[PDB]
Amino acid sequence: LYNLKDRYGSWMIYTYSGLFCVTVNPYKWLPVYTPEVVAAYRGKKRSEAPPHIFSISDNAYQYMLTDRENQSILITGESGAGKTVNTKRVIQYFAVIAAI
Amino acid sequence: FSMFDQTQIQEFKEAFTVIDQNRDGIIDKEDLRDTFAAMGRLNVKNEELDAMMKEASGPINFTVFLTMFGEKLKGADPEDVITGAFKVLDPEGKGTIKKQFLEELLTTQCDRFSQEEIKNMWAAFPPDVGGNVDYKNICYVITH
Amino acid sequence: EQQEDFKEAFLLFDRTGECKITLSQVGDVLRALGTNPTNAEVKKVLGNPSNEEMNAKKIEFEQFLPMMQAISNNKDQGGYEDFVEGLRVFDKEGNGTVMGAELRHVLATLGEKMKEEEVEALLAGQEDSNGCINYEAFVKHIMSV
Amino acid sequence: LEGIRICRKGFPNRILYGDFRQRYRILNPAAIPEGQFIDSRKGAEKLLSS
Amino acid sequence: HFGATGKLASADIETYLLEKSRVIFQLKAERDYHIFYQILSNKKPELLDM
Numbered sequence: 001l002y003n004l005k006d007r008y009g010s011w012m013i014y015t016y017s018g019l020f021c022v023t024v025n026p027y028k029w030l031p032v033y034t035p036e037v038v039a040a041y042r043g044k045k046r047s048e049a050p051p052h053i054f055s056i057s058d059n060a061y062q063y064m065l066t067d068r069e070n071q072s073i074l075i076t077g078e079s080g081a082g083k084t085v086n087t088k089r090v091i092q093y094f095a096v097i098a099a100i
Numbered sequence: 101f102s103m104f105d106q107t108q109i110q111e112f113k114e115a116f117t118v119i120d121q122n123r124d125g126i127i128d129k130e131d132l133r134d135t136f137a138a139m140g141r142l143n144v145k146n147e148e149l150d151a152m153m154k155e156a157s158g159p160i161n162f163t164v165f166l167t168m169f170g171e172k173l174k175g176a177d178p179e180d181v182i183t184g185a186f187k188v189l190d191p192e193g194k195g196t197i198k199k200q201f202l203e204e205l206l207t208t209q210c211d212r213f214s215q216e217e218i219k220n221m222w223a224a225f226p227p228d229v230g231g232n233v234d235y236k237n238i239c240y241v242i243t244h
Numbered sequence: 245e246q247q248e249d250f251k252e253a254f255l256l257f258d259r260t261g262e263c264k265i266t267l268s269q270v271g272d273v274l275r276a277l278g279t280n281p282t283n284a285e286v287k288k289v290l291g292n293p294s295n296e297e298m299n300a301k302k303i304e305f306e307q308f309l310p311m312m313q314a315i316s317n318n319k320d321q322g323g324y325e326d327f328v329e330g331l332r333v334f335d336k337e338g339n340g341t342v343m344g345a346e347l348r349h350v351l352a353t354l355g356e357k358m359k360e361e362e363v364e365a366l367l368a369g370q371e372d373s374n375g376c377i378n379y380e381a382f383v384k385h386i387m388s389v
Numbered sequence: 390l391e392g393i394r395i396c397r398k399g400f401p402n403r404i405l406y407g408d409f410r411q412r413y414r415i416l417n418p419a420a421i422p423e424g425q426f427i428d429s430r431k432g433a434e435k436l437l438s439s
Numbered sequence: 440h441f442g443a444t445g446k447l448a449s450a451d452i453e454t455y456l457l458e459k460s461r462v463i464f465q466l467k468a469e470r471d472y473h474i475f476y477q478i479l480s481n482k483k484p485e486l487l488d489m
């Protein structure tokens with residue numbers, strides 16, 4: 001809770017819980033989704049990068065290329081949490097990665 | 101002679117031997133009149149035909165023909181290499197770049213010639229809807 | 245005499261006369277001439293400029309040519325067997341083939357970084373239709389310098 | 390929180406012996422010399438012990 | 440879908456069930472689907488009169 005609350009208190013919304021991410025919703029539009037923040041995740045592995053959904057998208061693209069296996073990213077929560085926007089961000093991830 | 105491809109030399113020989121209409125071995129005003137009337141059109145009635153002799157008065161042989169064209173040929177190169185060079189110059193290799201890219205680069209990268217001649221040719225067509233430099237047409241308009 | 249030859253080759257390399265020489269181009273003339281030293285060492289002999297310093301401020305080639313010669317004498321150039329030792333790690337099935345996506349990933353991300361655009365140019369015209377490159381041909385392509 | 394427990398207590402990553410032996414043999418090429426015969430399991434045991 | 444070279448290749452949208460009941464009935468404090476009001480609340484009269 002307090003890892004979340006001190007992060008979100010500083011509008012650091014993303015944290016990992018081991019292998020994956022937990023996101024507590026900012027109703028404010030934070031800059032954590034700027035398309036130039038996506039590039040900072042390019043190849044930046046989970047132990048190096050600060051937690052974000054873009055880290056999970058990069059991890060799925062890395063396990064894809066290494067294991068030669070299909071991957072998935074399973075956005076979940078209550079209503080109003082950001083699943084549609086996080087989906088739009090994951091899709092934005094792959095869109096801008098292919099865009100450069 | 102080392103500057104010339106033997107193809108152009110033989111073409112100059114073919115042109116010189118066909119142009120001597122009276123088997124003269126030399127060129128005169130009357131030969132120019134028949135050449136312009138047969139090759140061109142009746143509009144060649146202007147006095148300018150007399151000015152053409154002023155450029156090279158008196159008989160001239162194939163050797164002086166070759167030397168005069170060779171000095172006049174400064175900046176000219178065989179078409180086959182120019183076709184290859186244009187195909188290499190295009191990034192797509194197929195004549196589809198816009199004029200503004202090529203005129204900016206040519207003026208920037210070397211030899212700041214006057215912009216107006218390249219601009220008049222490349223802007224002779226709108227670069228936004230017809231900017232494709234189909235280099236075969238460019239090289240042929242220069243020559244063929 | 246060889247330094248004078250390198251100087252005229254650099255004058256023919258330079259992109260425009262307005263470039264008295266940018267450190268970006270200093271690295272590019274290093275890489276394009278018959279040398280390819282690791283950047284941290286040459287930046288060390290220059291004096292380790294900051295990234296904004298290296299981008300904004302200018303350099304003079306005159307002093308660059310002696311250090312160019314010195315690093316050429318250091319000869320941090322690899323070797324064909326060393327390259328095969330390096331690239332063979334990717335030959336996971338041991339048949340002489342490596343996957344181009346793996347090469348772009350490590351060559352862009354892991355060492356001296358290159359954007360996806362220049363690594364694409366790096367593989368443009370030689371990448372296989374299935375996507376598996378044969379390392380002996382790739383090392384030979386590198387050997388073409 | 391269970392996903393934290395299982396990620397800390399468990400083993401988040403596993404690699405096939407052939408894929409990793411070939412991939413990271415680079416850590417100690419004397420443990421996995423080329424040309425010479427090496428078992429992936431036994432080689433992996435030596436490398437990791439090294 | 441990604442190709443072998445890792446570049447974006449294709450995508451596939453599968454949708455499971457639209458809340459069709461909403462089209463004709465909404466409780467207090469909730470809208471019908473946004474397409475309805477955004478065509479009614481309109482900057483473009485042509486959509487409103489067509």
Ligand SMILES: Nc1ncnc2c1ncn2[C@@H]1O[C@H](COP(=O)(O)OP(=O)(O)O)[C@@H](O)[C@H]1O
Pocket residue numbers: 013025026027028029030078079080081082083084085086
């Ligand atoms: N991380 C976030 N940043 C900015 N706005 C958010 C975030 N998460 C949720 N919201 C806002 O909350 C509302 C719901 O977001 P949405 O992605 O549609 O989730 P859901 O589909 O569960 O309603 C939207 O108005 C959205 O702008």
Ligand SMILES: CC(C)n1c(=O)cc(N[C@@H](C)c2ccccc2)[nH]c1=O
Pocket residue numbers: 062063066067401402403404405
């Ligand atoms: C079985 C599963 C949990 N798993 C692993 O346990 C390890 C995976 N991949 C390894 C090979 C890897 C490590 C680092 C970067 C890319 C890939 N993939 C996986 O899918």
Ligand SMILES: [Mg+2]
Pocket residue numbers: 120121122124126127128130131
């Ligand atoms: Mg005559």
